[PDB]
Design a protein around this nucleic acid. Sequence first.
RNA 1: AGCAUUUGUCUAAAAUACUUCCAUUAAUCAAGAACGAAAGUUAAGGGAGUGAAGACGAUCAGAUACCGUCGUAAUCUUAACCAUAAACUAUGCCGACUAGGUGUUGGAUGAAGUGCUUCCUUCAGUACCUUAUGAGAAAUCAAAGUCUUUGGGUUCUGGGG
RNA 2: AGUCUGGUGCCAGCAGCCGCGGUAAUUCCAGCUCCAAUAGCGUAUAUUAAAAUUGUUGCAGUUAAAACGCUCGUAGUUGA
Lengths: 195, 62, 224, 72, 95, 129
Amino acid sequence: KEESIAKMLICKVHIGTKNLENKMKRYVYTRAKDGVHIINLAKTYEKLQLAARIIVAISNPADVVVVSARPFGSRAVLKFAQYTGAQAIAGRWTPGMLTNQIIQKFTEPRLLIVTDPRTDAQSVKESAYANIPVIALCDSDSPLEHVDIAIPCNNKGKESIALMYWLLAQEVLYLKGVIPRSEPWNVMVDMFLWR
Amino acid sequence: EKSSKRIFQGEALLRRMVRQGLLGENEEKLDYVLGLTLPKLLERRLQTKVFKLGLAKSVHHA
Amino acid sequence: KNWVPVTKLGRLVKEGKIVSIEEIYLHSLPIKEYQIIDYFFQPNECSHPLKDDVVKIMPVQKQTRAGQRTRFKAFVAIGDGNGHCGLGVKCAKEVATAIRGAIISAKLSLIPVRRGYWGNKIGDPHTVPMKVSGKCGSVRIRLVPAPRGTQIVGAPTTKKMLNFAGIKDCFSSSCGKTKTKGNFLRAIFNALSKTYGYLTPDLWKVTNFDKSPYEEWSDFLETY
Amino acid sequence: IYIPRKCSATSRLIPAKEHGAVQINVGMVDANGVYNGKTETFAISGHVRQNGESDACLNRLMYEKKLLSFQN
Amino acid sequence: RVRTKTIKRAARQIVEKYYAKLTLDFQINKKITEEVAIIPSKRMKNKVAGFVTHLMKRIQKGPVRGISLKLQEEERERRLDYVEPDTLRMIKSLG
Amino acid sequence: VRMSVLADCLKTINNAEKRGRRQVLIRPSSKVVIKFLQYMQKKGYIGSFEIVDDHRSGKIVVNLLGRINKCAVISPRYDVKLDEIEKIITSILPSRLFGHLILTTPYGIMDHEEARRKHTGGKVLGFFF
RNA sequence: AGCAUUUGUCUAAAAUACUUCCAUUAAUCAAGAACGAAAGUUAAGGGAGUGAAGACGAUCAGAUACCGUCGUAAUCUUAACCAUAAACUAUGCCGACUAGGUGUUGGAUGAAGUGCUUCCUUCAGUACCUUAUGAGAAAUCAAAGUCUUUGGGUUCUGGGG
RNA sequence: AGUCUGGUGCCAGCAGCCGCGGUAAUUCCAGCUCCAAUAGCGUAUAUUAAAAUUGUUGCAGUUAAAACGCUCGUAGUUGA
């Protein structure tokens, strides 16, 4: 109830850094004197729930593609993919994955899930020419072009990415028939990172 | 619409199209005059009529 | 003949789950499969099969230390004559190959035009529904609506393209240097393209839009 | 003949060969917070996405539909 | 010197399906490679055997790019399995 | 000097609609500009607008409906006789079934069809699509 | 155009601020006028260095040139004149509207470093970087955009070599 | 609408323009066939369209031609 919000608070999600982003200032709470930007997070939890509503409204999880070019978030997306059968892309992205019909590596998805718009920018840009909506875990210095749902998150830290994917996973599992919402989910929790 | 010169001249033109037979029974407004075509005018030639009636065996014979 | 669509959306058209090109146009879906066009514009069952025409073939040249390295660019114009035009462009180092490539490009290019009445309801959309202008390089070309029995005019190329679109009556105009033919063709195609993109009073009406083919046939798409 | 899609955000028309605009399906909830059968659909232009304004627009649209509480 | 793409590709195929047959020794690797792959020249076979042996040396010292061993995959899957004041101030500021 | 108040306002409205913001705050205000917005609202282009008081000159906040293709002015307001109107609309309008050419005639600012119905020329004022 | 030693004197200037005054005085402007680098002219100084002209030594096929050494007129000031320069933001000037960020110079507003100093917000200047389903022939241009979807105001200029 | 048949051979010559002609000429001189318009068709000169290439509608002036060196300013034009 509060506990999900509180865990999000305890993880370093609220730390925006250098430059607000003009557009994102409605999700920033205040500029800190220390040179870091505070993120609202209350709106983020509800927005994350909306992202879950859009994901559940995709009738098959395999047509939902996850992407990360961040080493530690590669492990996180892979964990996300294990729990709900979204296909993950890690390491070097290939532009033809959405644009080149005859390529070996091809994906014809309905949705894209992005770990950071600054790192995973090429895929996001290509996705707009291939008309895919793009939901995005976004940070203060990361661009907001061609994403439909923006979920504010400190994308720099391992814990923050893990927390978002863990919360997201629970919400989709709850929306799905897997587990009652009242019941807590506990299937190998907090095991989402590596060196 | 309803402009006095235009409706008079328009009724007069359509009446003339009726006199010529260039417009027949099923066509009766200024947009059918725009609908008129070069074959329709050519069909009005006497040689076409003579050939059609079968007084002669061909357009040239007509 | 023999067929195989690599894309899932292609397979749906091949089966006939998607009935016509209008639905894929509605959901604005990109096409890299010529077989989709081939299925929709088949010689029978279709009311108006496409007619192609190689509008302009030009040699263009790389030039080296040694030989010429002469390539062939090819422009082809395709139309149903009733609502769907296509302008297709390919450069290749052999003519027949260039001609084939341009035809495939034309199918990919294939776009629906809108037409209207010059005034009162005659039941036949016959002329452009408004003044539309298309630009490429120097040349900006404007199609402007004309009354009935007031046939299309222009350059040969313009005349063919409008005929391919099924535009019966038009006034045409042009601004710039008309000589550059590929740019001229492209500019006509750009102007022509705008006809079914232009917002109009008839479209003030708030109206529901259908769910995606990717959800209507989701099970069938999972299946094969 | 047919009627092309119009953007939910900007109330303006989306071309056939635009190839960037998207339809966002939003799942309705059950009272216990489970996925309902029915789903609300919205059309988002490639242009609004190109601007980067889609999240803001979505918020106003969700606010109108009563699917987000904070408006902005 | 170096080793060409054909040699490297053949070496990459090897290990992937055949690490459980591989060993440190080059002469035994020459036998294994001949047994496993129907390579048409001695020169080519010796080069593939050599590079596969070189990959063997690289292996155990560390993971190597462009190949996969199912025992390592299994091992990796197995292997992975209010607040204090300075933390507090942002939360308090939120309320 | 301030030049043509109507023109800059309409360009601003045009820019607002082109951009897709769909509301704008007009810094000038005048009786004719208000009437022109009322005429656009009359022809279904504009929703509600609020003119807010300031003693020097009010300001206007207009709600735009996602519906203007263009709005523009004929500058200066050239005189035009009744039968010359037919050529003017033919020149300007994108369609013969849509787009509106506005004049000021002795009975106020109104479109070309209204003026024709009247039978009066005027000064031609502006237009929108 | 152009303007860099020190201090003084005589002067102008813009922004900021203003619950100060006026009440449309304006904008751009044929005609006309002012100012207008460097060189040139004319006269007085002054005339060091530099140094059009000019003189030699070379260099070199020759070299009257680049290069070396010398060196008048000029460069400097006063007093008159002269009125052109790639006198180039090769972008007439005023007007509005458009998109962000990094800076930066001059003020005002708030807060915290130690009245002063810093930082925050905001103005008038001023550059850069990225973005232009904006423009353009592209280069590029936040103006060269908002211009066949062509009329914010106005001056000047061009019509193949 | 002809890589048609012979002759000339950077000559003779033709051809609004591009060009053709230095030996196998698809342009010259013949012959043949074909094509366009037709009791009319060539040729010159002048003129309109062509030319949104003089631009009220409706031009252009960073780099292609073209912003007065600069500012003030009377007539001028424009006027919250």
